[model samples]
Target: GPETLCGAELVDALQFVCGDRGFYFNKPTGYGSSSRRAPQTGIVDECCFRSCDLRRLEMYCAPLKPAKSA
Candidate 1:
């Protein structure tokens, strides 16, 4: 089963990692947030990032460990 930190969460996580200035995509978006160049992926799926030029403030995704079962 998929976890909570999957879709958009993953994006947020990346944003934080990149200082909330880079754009990202999970499965390669034909048209994503503004960027210097087109987005690209390497390892996990089609994850992509722009660069530390946007200067965003809001906190992106935050991957967390799964909750323990009762």
Candidate 2:
């Protein structure tokens, strides 16, 4: 499910962590989700950011869980 977000949210997503596990921005196959591997995976699917379809942000809901590298 692609939800709307901004770069700020992207930052938040990238910052959150579940232990060593974290979120990774998964782009559409067209955006290259597998072309590069971003550390930590919390099942982030294709989503929209800043009204741009360029990249996506994702994460698990609740304290039960929690994109990018660095």
Candidate 3:
């Protein structure tokens, strides 16, 4: 969902990665979702970011895994 925060955090984390390159921000296309390419995939239709320089920019997410049995 749009409020999941993973995607939102990705946008936020991108800023730290950006450092001096520029900045990270999102344009609200009145939609939200984790997936973008898929129409019914993302939480929102427009919550995304575009880098000023494609290769020059770097974005990533922390490794995630299924919870292990306690």
Candidate 4:
């Protein structure tokens, strides 16, 4: 939304964009056409993309910090 925003909506957009492949947290770039499963944070509360549906705002109102790497 509005060029930049570290929030949930962005995450959803990412999933939608990726389709069945889903999104990944931090993994090697495929760099190839062959699709493969990867790790992702999955959907969580907060970080709502500003461009997303306003009606669903409540579902993601609570913000969440990205998971810390081990």
TM-score: model 2 vs. ground truth: 0.28
Model 2's number of clashes is 1
Q: Assess candidate 3 and give its TM-score to the true structure.
A: 0.24
User: Which number leads on lDDT?
Assistant: 2
Expressed as tens digits, the lDDT of each residue in 1-70 for candidate 1 is 1222334654554555443334323222234564433233221332223221112211121112221111
Q: What local lDDT score does residue 42 receive in model 2, on the 0 to 100 scale?
A: 31
Clashing residue pairs in candidate 4 are: 7-47, 8-47, 8-48, 9-48, 9-49
Candidates in descending TM-score order = 2, 4, 1, 3
Residues 14-58 of candidate 2 have per-residue lDDT tens digits of 454432454334542223435544332333332222322222232
| Candidate 3 C-alpha error for residue 69, in Å | 32
Off by over 4 Å in 3: 1-5, 23-70
lDDT (10s digit) by residue, model 3, range 1-70: 1222236554554444454444423222123653333232221222233222223122222111211110
Clashing residue pairs in candidate 2, if any?
14-67
lDDT winner between 1 and 4, please give it: 4
Which stretch of 10 consecutive residues in model 2 shows the poorest summed lDDT? 61-70
Residue-wise C-alpha lDDT for candidate 4, range 5-49, written one tens digit per residue: 345545654444333433343322233552433232222222232
Q: What is the C-alpha RMSD of each candidate to the true structure, in Å?
A: 12.7, 9.6, 12.4, 12.7
Query: How displaced is residue 70 in candidate 4, in Å?
Result: 27
- List per-prediction Cα lDDT, in the order shown: 0.29, 0.34, 0.30, 0.32
lDDT of 2 at 39: 35
